[PDB]
Amino acid sequence: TGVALEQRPISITRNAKQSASLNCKILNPVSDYVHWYRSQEGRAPERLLVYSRSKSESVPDPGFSADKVRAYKGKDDTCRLIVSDLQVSDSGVYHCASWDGRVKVFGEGTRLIVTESAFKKKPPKPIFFLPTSEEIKQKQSGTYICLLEDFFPNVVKTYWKEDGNSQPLDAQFGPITGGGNSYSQVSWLTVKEDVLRKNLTYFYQHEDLGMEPKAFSISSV
Amino acid sequence: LTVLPLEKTLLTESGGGTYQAGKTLSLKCQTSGFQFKTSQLDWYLWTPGHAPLWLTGLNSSSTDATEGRITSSREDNKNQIFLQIEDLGLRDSGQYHCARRVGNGDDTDKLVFGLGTRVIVEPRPAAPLSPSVFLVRDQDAVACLIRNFYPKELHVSLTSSGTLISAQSLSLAPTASGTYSAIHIGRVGENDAITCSVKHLGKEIHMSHQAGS
Ligand SMILES: *[C@@H]1O[C@H](CO)[C@@H](O[C@@H]2O[C@H](CO)[C@@H](O)[C@H](O)[C@H]2NC(C)=O)[C@H](O)[C@H]1NC(C)=O
Ligand SMILES: *[C@@H]1O[C@H](CO)[C@@H](O)[C@H](O)[C@H]1NC(C)=O
């Protein structure tokens, strides 16, 4: 049915000398090896280690110590990457990957953030704006707007679905704006009048929510 | 004693920049340090926030790609491989990486990547289009919705009886039709008079919710 890898939560924030466990739920596996790549701004992405699920064996690539990075097994046939003794230089996006023939398939990645400053995680506070009559009158279409505010860290994932479909809709997303301990992001969905009667669901994920998305229903009623 | 191939995998991608939708992307990857003719080389798309995606790859006997509009090719006397993507759209933006498969030959093989090169796809120019402007409210939050303008440069301002309100901020994004739309957010009491004022190509557009006659 096609190989696919899932990674949650979308970010992990830590102070120095702590550790971090990254999750990879691999579905329809076609291979025995789970690969862990790291991406950092301005550097070439590179593989850190490869893990054999069967032999339950974690093999680091040169430059990486098994004391520093190590993969093991988790609940529900999940591969997990532990990064010990975190330093700021460890921040970046960590992707699990799997070979599927001559093609390598990658998870979406979890962002590891290591900082030397005190921090507190803060969940998005959503604010919804609904289509206005004037917009429908002038454009025969209506825009749903969700503003997420005052979250930390500056990592968030949002998507719109309509009931009966499972492909995210083509929404517009603004940049993540802010600084210090408070970031925000607005997204919005412009749809034709026919779709204005259908039911929509809005989702977001954030590290302060753990793994489970928050979901809102938008309906006629 | 151990026996290993004497090689380093050096890959340098070029050709990135800002492209107009509909144009053809042509990238080059200059390789060095390993035996070129017998190698296996691929192109991967790393778009921030998405899964890295295989696009196409090749060796001396075969090539494949994810879509018809995507192809790759080789220049042997120069140790280069190329990427071509016709009919670029907004989804093709991201960081394009050349990759080499390295290892024993099995599922323990790794990809070695270069630094990549950044591609930004933007809408193709078309006739100037003035936006429409809509005010929307939820409690003490006011959104100013600005729909379908081209080109992207504009100036927005939310004001309550003439003075700038606090905590204004502007988000702008392309749409599928090749135009832009934008949302300007601010904070103001649900009963205050509010005006959203947009300047675009020297024309002024606005909506206001009055508090008095
Ligand atoms: C969206 O969901 C709502 C319920 O959340 C649907 O409203 C129901 O509509 C049926 C008729 O099809 C009524 O018999 C129910 O009493 C309604 N329930 C509520 C709570 O209002 C609505 O029909 C859905 N919209 C679509 C397009 O399916
Ligand atoms: C080229 O790649 C194809 C597809 O992965 C593979 O089957 C073939 O053996 C490769 N040829 C060489 C010479 O490596």
Side-chain angles (χ1 to χ4, degrees), chain A residues 78-124 126-166 168-197 199-220:
Chain A
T78 284
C79 190
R80 292 181 78 112
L81 170 70
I82 294 196
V83 186
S84 310
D85 185 55
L86 290 171
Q87 309 296 325
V88 295
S89 62
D90 298 323
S91 307
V93 187
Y94 292 65
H95 300 264
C96 58
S98 188
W99 282 115
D100 185 354
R102 47 102 72 259
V103 160
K104 206 136 170 183
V105 189
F106 285 70
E108 218 176 79
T110 295
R111 179 176 282 280
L112 180 61
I113 304 168
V114 192
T115 177
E116 255 146 36
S117 304
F119 68 90
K120 241 173 273 176
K121 304 189 301 284
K122 308 202 298 202
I127 300 183
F128 293 94
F129 307 87
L130 293 105
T132 59
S133 301
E134 201 55 39
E135 184 190 6
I136 293 142
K137 181 222 220 303
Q138 294 183 224
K139 309 286 284 213
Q140 282 192 110
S141 49
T143 304
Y144 304 84
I145 300 164
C146 182
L147 165 67
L148 295 177
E149 44 180 31
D150 199 36
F151 54 84
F152 184 96
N154 62 337
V155 181
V156 71
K157 175 175 181 188
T158 68
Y159 39 110
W160 307 69
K161 298 190 180 318
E162 63 184 320
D163 301 9
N165 185 347
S166 216
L169 304 164
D170 182 53
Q172 278 75 72
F173 308 85
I176 299 185
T177 72
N181 59 28
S182 180
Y183 296 84
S184 65
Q185 182 185 51
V186 70
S187 77
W188 64 101
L189 172 76
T190 303
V191 304
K192 298 183 183 39
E193 232 156 352
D194 325 65
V195 202
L196 282 183
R197 322 201 315 261
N199 287 343
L200 303 183
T201 304
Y202 170 85
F203 302 93
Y204 63 95
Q205 294 167 45
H206 190 272
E207 182 188 341
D208 202 50
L209 304 186
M211 289 174 45
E212 329 166 87
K214 188 65 177 295
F216 291 86
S217 160
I218 308 174
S219 56
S220 300

Side-chain angles (χ1 to χ4, degrees), chain B residues 6 27 30 40 48 54 88 97 104 106 110 125 185 201:
Chain B
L6 192 80
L27 303 188
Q30 178 73 72
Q40 169 76 44
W54 177 82
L88 287 173
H97 292 264
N104 302 320
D106 48 19
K110 58 180 186 168
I185 294 288
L201 300 176

Side-chain angles (χ1 to χ4, degrees), chain A residues 101-103, chain B residues 38-40 57-64 101:
Chain A
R102 47 102 72 259
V103 160
Chain B
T38 58
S39 74
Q40 169 76 44
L58 76 167
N59 57 42
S60 66
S61 62
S62 179
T63 186
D64 205 4
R101 177 170 186 148

